[PDB]
Amino acid sequence: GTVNWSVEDIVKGINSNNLESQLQATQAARKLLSREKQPPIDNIIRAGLIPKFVSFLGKTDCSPIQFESAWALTNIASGTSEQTKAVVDGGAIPAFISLLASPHAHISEQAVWALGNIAGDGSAFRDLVIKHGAIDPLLALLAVPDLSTLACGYLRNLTWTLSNLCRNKNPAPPLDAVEQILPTLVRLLHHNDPEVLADSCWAISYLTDGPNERIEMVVKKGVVPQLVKLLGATELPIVTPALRAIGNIVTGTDEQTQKVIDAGALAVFPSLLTNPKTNIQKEATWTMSNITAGRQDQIQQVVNHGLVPFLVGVLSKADFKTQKEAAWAITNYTSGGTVEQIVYLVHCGIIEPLMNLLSAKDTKIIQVILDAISNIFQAAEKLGETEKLSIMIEECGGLDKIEALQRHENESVYKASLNLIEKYF
């Protein structure tokens, strides 16, 4: 019946004066626009159909055409920015927000989905959806005693839409919308469905990607222990955003970082720093670098949790980007740590893989590593042990590498080298 129509036939039906003919034609459009490959989105836009779909959203008397037109527009809105823009330009936003109240679950769900694609386009559309008042009726759909009674697909869509309202920066979402959304997100973060959990963690990761004030508003909600728990999940799609959120939190203040440690996070790092997914090791090591940038009592906790040998491991062998994060974690540990914490680092065997990484063609990591060596030499001075360290650096071939570096392009680099060379070698 409505399979494989041409655009011209769809146009003909939609322009007929006959609501049933318009409904069949709209459903045909929904079918073109939902096919597996190359849906003809631009052809539908160019035929001028968006304004007719939008006014069909308002047909309370004909719920099937509301659904077909909502689904058609969702898919248009799922494409490029210019395509999402055409949906918005047709007035879709307030019309979808009014469908949130529909007594028909499949229809308010479609409106949720459409609004998520719109808000998902970027900050300006996200904030426009919020100005049109989307958040109150979105949140009313989740106002039930027990999330478990909602259909699973429906809750997943709501969660994902709310996370798009939390997403993007420049600017970040309005502080008041974030405050409005957060209690419902905290509730979603304790739900048992893995996709709900993954998207709740993504939303939390967006909200903590910002200055300390933004981080604080999340941390004040008490979510950190739940995040650390998800950090332990067996599902990679949950671990990845849980770890991103935890990593974002530890770029905040030392007190915000302490909440992550207090919640047990460090005990998960032995598995994270050896995780077979490269991106998990990289972001675990990034996270560690922002903890070793903390107070000496926080460095101490990294030590007590047995994590220095794990840093030595990733420095010795890892994808290069993870290794660059490990080099940072080490330079941070060495500028902030006590002499005894620094001595410990050397006893776990940091020197040889630090030196091996001096052969990399990345000026930044070379800078980072010479800073670290200089820091470690500073500790050895206070102990009168600079010579013991010079030799260690000699024996694993580090001296060769530092010498060469005198003849290096960069200023810090050849500057940093000559200094160590002339100071201890």
Binding site: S34, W71, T74, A77, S78, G79, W113, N117, G120, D121
Partner: peptide, 7 residues
Amino acid sequence: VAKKYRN
């Protein structure tokens, strides 16, 4: 992905 097409 920020956007999702309904198949």
